[PDB]
Each structure stands twice: as C-alpha cells, then as structure tokens.
C-alpha cells in the first residue's frame, strides 16, 4: 500500500518501525471508536441539530 | 428514562451532548469492570477479611 | 501457584490486596498485547534488522 506505509511511517526515513506499528494501531483502535459513537449519537439525534433532547432520548428504546 | 437521561446529561441543561455520551459510555466500561473484578475477588476471598491468602489463591485452581 | 503469588504479592507481605489483584491483571493485559504485536512485527520483517521497509510491507497482503 503506497498511501498507507507513508501513514505508520511518521518520521519519513522510508522504514516503519516498532514505535510506529504500536503507534499507528492505537491510533486507528481510537478512529475506529470514535467513528462509532458518533454513528449511533448522529443517529438518535433525529434533528442533527447536535444534542440530544429528552424525546429523542425517549423515542430510543425498543426494550 | 427518567433517571438516566439525567445522568448522562452533567451540566442538567436538559440536553446530551458529545460529550456527554462519550464520558457515559468510558465511566460505564470502567464500572462494569470493576464491579466484575470485585465480584472475583471477594469470590477467591473465602473469608471476606479483604486479602487473599496463600491457601485461598491455593484452594482457587481447578487445573 | 508458588512463584504466582509471589509475583501478584508486591509489597510481600504474605497477602494479595484488591489494588494488587487490580494491577496485576492490568500488568498482564499490556504484556499479552505488546507480545502479540511484536510477534506481528518480528513476522513483517523478514530479514528481522529491526525495521520494516516498503517491500516487505509490500510482500505482506493477501488481499
Ligand atoms: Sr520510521
Ligand atoms: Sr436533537
Ligand atoms: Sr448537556
Ligand atoms: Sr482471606
Ligand atoms: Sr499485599
Ligand atoms: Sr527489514
């Protein structure tokens, strides 16, 4: 991947190192997170007017 | 919920934000962990004194 | 276990606390992962010198 390998190696030196592959994973855990969360906030705030109000909140439970 | 809109909403400005659901959700992970290492640990504790002693940890292996 | 106590038992004081049961469990998450990576890595760089370079990143997708 040529994209990609420029990614993990951050300081450019054309290798990938330890620190790099460790660093790279933990940042992608985190995105992969965050992405989620937003997907199911996104999702119950009917309004996306970016909060959450008691209804919507309410209108989130099939159980 | 009643109650649990209102514990997720900190500020009780009567909405949910980002945020909001972002520290939710880490303090309820944080929780349901230490509740279940607790429940094995007062579990190896036969005599709930609050330590484990050779012989419990001992008498806690079934192989 | 003989040395497992000993290990979990920081203070030596003949007893396992909760902080200590706490920690140890935390101690062997990151262990467990740090050892699963590098066994990644180590397997990436083929001509183990410490560092990966494209081609190896390269001659490492299946699809
Ligand atoms: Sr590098
Ligand atoms: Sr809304
Ligand atoms: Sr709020
Ligand atoms: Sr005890
Ligand atoms: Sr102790
Ligand atoms: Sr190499």
Same mark, same amino acid.
Not at 5 to 29: L, T
Not at 40 to 46: E, L, M, Q, R, Y
């Given at each position: ?12 030196? *054309? ?32 309004? *996306? ?12 439970? *099939?159980?």
């Amino acid at each position: 991947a040529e994209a990609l390998f420029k990614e993990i190696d951050v300081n450019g030196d *054309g290798a990938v190192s330890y620190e790099e592959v460790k660093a790279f994973v933990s940042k992608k855990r985190a995105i992969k997170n965050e992405q989620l969360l937003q997907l199911i906030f996104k999702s119950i705030d009917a309004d *996306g007017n970016g909060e959450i109000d008691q209804n919507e909140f309410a209108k989130f439970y *099939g159980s």
